[PDB]
Design brief:
homotetramer, mainly alpha, 3 helices, elongated, SPI-1 type 3 secretion system needle filament protein (chains A, B, C, D)
Chain lengths: 80, 80, 80, 80
Amino acid sequence: MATPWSGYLDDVSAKFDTGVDNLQTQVTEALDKLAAKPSDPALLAAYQSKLSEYNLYRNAQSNTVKVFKDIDAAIIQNFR
Amino acid sequence: MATPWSGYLDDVSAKFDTGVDNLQTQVTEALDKLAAKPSDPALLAAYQSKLSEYNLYRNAQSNTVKVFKDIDAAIIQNFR
Amino acid sequence: MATPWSGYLDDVSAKFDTGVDNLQTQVTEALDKLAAKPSDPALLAAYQSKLSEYNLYRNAQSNTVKVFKDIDAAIIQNFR
Amino acid sequence: MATPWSGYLDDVSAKFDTGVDNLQTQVTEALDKLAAKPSDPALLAAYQSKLSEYNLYRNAQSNTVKVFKDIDAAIIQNFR
């Protein structure tokens, strides 16, 4: 049997991965559609919201690892 | 079973879609009608009202994502 | 193979062009006919109606590019 | 064999390029036509719309590269 990787920081990353799982394909689909369409009321606005959603996936993930590693580093320094 | 995308910002966007669902086809139908018509006072007033209806929908999406993102950005940046 | 220019704003402009394609030649034909005539009730009413049709083509095109660019500018500004 | 440059930010730039590939020559053609004419309502509306399209290419490109670099900079700062 395979043993799943148990981690607090890894779980948070996987939580966002499952949420925007199909969102990744939606971003690339809207990006290619806009490529051959200069000005688009629909495509540009749709991509606007979907791009910011991707923006949060990368920002929120980097924020959780930032806070966790900082406080965790202080604990590791105590062990001496 | 498939799980739907649960989001506050996504709900507002999809909420406007249900309202202008058949409205999108009405814009293209009136566009082709005017394209092959020299001058009509009736179709001019019809397209005029339908044009802004689309304008308000698209501007509402960029509006909700703008005000919600600004306040949410301050919250996520607080997490440090 | 040649790739056609795909654009929503350009489609609206070309839409009116297919409608008043032979209309442009009709305006110049009636203009020269009016210039060689002192006063005629028939050509006056004919040119009057055809003049407004040309006015609708130039106005409808400038109207669509104006309302569309305004709303699309809001979206573009969000990208930051 | 040659290896193509794989980049997300570069892909977005080239994405807009494939669309307005022949538009660059269309802008210069309309520019020379405008300089060789005193005043034309037809070319004024044409160049106006085409100038908006060139603004689309330079804006969306600079817009996407700006938001992507910001969140990407946060990740790089995390690696320490």
